[PDB]
DNA sequence: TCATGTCAAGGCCGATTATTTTTTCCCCAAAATCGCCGGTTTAAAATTCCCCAGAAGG
């Protein structure tokens, strides 16, 4: 979940010719994570989750 | 050399291949050598730690470390440690919590004890100090920024955000303080902090370091602590409250009765950390509300105002 | 002593608890990249050895 700026920085510094491992060191990210993000379309910073059960569900129709 | 300066590419094989494409008649391996001193100086830079100049930062840090039942009420004890970098001296105090007002109070106490201010102050990520950091755009606060400008220092919270090079030293000093002090003055945390201050003045700030072999107090004395403004930026909670047409308002669960002119208008309550409430309306100051330790119901306040008007 | 407005609910914010996802750290194995040292090759510089002319001494 590296933010827009983090992903932009990773992609740019990698494409400039800078080595990937020291890129990860500089940005404080795991080498596997950085390498995976190298070949990625756009910055991933969103997680989608659907609704979940609550306590007032059985009573909701009655209310 | 320019490639390293600009692109920071300390890759030796790659640079040799590039210049070979550019017409290099030399050998990969001596370029590997040459780029080694470069990347080795880079690794020296990586290992560069403890770049503390006299009066640079006071290494602020907060942490909940204790729990007490003060006056029969459970409360979590929060400790603040400001370590003065080069000198290695540190001001330590654990009072109530990690609220911003107590943070500023502790900073003021540390400045008074050190008799001045450093160039900048380095904090740790938390709810206070900075509300939120967005891709380097660190918007700390408005009141906190005003306080920093008033005292002179500036916030520079950029420590390593990992357990390495930040957590290691933090926990080291934390448990070193906990074990060496381990004091228990009395149920009242205020008395505990009083004995903590005595212990700090006795065997903490006057405890020579094994490596340096000199008490940090001398370095603190020789450090640059620019004179503090000699006055304290207000350490009182500021909070607005609307007055009902009854000439009444509320604050922290207690309801106060104002006069006719104040009904239907927004007053500003200012509460020192001391524990006294002062009501400021439209810039001016209004009559004190004779705050009392025992809580009185709104009915008793109405009765009191009735008798007073009688 | 007269007369004299009062109480409850809703909304919002903060803190705490519970659940899910992401990132990091440590240990082990394999592959790739980088660094250092040694050897070889190429280019440049230094020293010594033979014959012609000039100068000095007996």
Q: What is the DSSP letter of B247?
A: T
Distance between CA B158 and CA B160 in Å, rounded?
A: 7
Distance between CA B168 and CA B291 in Å, rounded?
A: 46
Contacts of B169 (CB under 8 A, 6+ apart): none
Distance between CA B93 and CA B181 in Å, rounded?
A: 12
Nearest to A40 by CA among A7, A14, A12, A9: A7
Q: Does A21 touch chain B (CB under 8 A)?
A: no
Sheet with B236-242, strands from edge to edge, namely B236-242, B266-272, B277-281, B284-285
Which spans in chain B are helix H?
2-7, 12-21, 28-46, 100-114, 143-151, 168-181, 189-199, 216-222, 298-309
Q: Does B11 touch chain A (CB under 8 A)?
A: yes
Residue B124, token pair as written in the block: 């740790």
Distance between CA B148 and CA B104 in Å, rounded?
A: 9
Taking CA atoms, B215 is separated from B64, B83, B196, B220, in Å, by: 28, 14, 19, 9
Residue B262, token pair as written in the block: 């104040």
Four-CA torsion B272, B274, B276, B281, nearest 10 degrees? -10
Distance between CA B62 and CA B154 in Å, rounded?
A: 18
Q: After which residues does chain B have a break in its backbone, defined as C to next N over 2.5 Å?
A: none
Contacts of B288 (CB under 8 A, 6+ apart): B278, B279
Q: What are phi and psi of B83, to 5 degrees?
A: -100, 125
Taking CB atoms and an 8 Å cutoff, what residues of chain A touch B136?
5
Residue B64, token pair as written in the block: 């909940």
Angle in degrees, CA B163, B169, B170, rounded to 5: 80
Helix axes B12-21, B28-46, angle to 10 degrees: 140
Give me the DSSP letters along A5-63. Answer: HHHHHHHHHHHTT--HHHHHHHHT--HHHHHHHHT-SS------------SSTTTTTT-
Nearest to B45 by CA among B82, B75, B14, B8: B8
Nearest to A28 among B14, B135, B161 (CB): B161
Task: Note every long-range contact of B202-205, with CB atoms under 8 Å and residues 24 or more positions apart, other chains counting.
Answer: B204/B90, B204/B92, B204/B177, B204/B180, B205/B89, B205/B90
Four-CA torsion B144, B150, B151, B154, nearest 10 degrees? 50
Three-class SS of residue B284? strand
CA atoms within 13 A on the CB side of B187: 6
Q: Rg for chain A (alpha carbons), in Å? A: 20
Angle in degrees, CA B253, B259, B261, rounded to 5: 120
Picking from B9, B15, B18 by the largest number of A CB atoms within 10 A of its own CB, the best residue to mutate is B9
Taking CB atoms and an 8 Å cutoff, what residues of chain A touch B135?
3-6
CB B246 within 8 A of CB B256: no
């Amino acid at each position: 979940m590296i933010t827009r700026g983090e992903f932009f920085m990773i992609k740019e510094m990698y494409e400039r010719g800078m080595s990937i491992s020291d890129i990860a060191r500089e940005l404080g990210i795991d080498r596997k994570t950085v390498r995976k993000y190298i070949h990625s379309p756009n910055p991933p910073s969103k997680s989608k989750r659907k609704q979940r059960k609550s306590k007032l569900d059985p009573f909701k129709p009655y209310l | 050399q320019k490639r390293m300066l600009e692109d920071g590419v300390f890759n030796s094989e790659k640079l040799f291949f590039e210049i070979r494409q550019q017409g290099y008649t030399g050998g990969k391996t001596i370029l590997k050598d040459y780029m080694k001193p470069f990347r080795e100086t880079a690794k020296k830079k990586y290992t560069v730690r403890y770049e503390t100049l006299p009066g640079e930062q006071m290494q602020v840090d907060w942490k909940e470390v204790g729990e007490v039942v003060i006056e029969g009420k459970k409360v979590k004890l929060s400790l603040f440690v400001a370590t003065l970098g080069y000198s290695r001296m540190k001001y330590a105090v654990f009072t109530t919590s990690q609220d911003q007002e107590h943070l500023m109070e502790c900073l003021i106490q540390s400045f008074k004890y050190f008799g001045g201010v450093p160039k900048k102050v380095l904090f740790d990520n938390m709810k206070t100090v900075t509300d939120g950091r967005e891709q380097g755009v660190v918007k700390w606060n408005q009141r906190f920024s005003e306080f920093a400008s008033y005292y002179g220092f500036i916030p520079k919270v950029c420590r390593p955000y990992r357990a390495q090079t930040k957590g290691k030293v933090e926990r080291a000093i934390q448990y070193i303080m906990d074990h060496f002090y381990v004091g228990t003055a009395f149920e009242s945390i205020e008395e505990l902090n009083f004995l903590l201050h005595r212990w700090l003045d006795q065997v903490a700030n006057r405890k020579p370091n094994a490596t340096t072999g000199i008490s940090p107090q001398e370095r603190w004395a020789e450090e640059s602590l620019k004179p503090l403004p000699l006055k304290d930026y207000d350490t009182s909670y500021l909070s607005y409250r609307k007055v009902h047409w009854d000439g009444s308002f509320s604050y922290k669960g207690e309801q106060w009765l104002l006069s006719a002119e104040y009904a239907g208008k927004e007053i500003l309550v200012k509460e020192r950390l001391n524990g006294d409430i002062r009501l400021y309306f439209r810039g001016e100051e209004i009559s004190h509300v004779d705050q009392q330790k025992k809580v009185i119901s709104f009915a008793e306040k109405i009765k009191k105002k009735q008798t007073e008007m009688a």
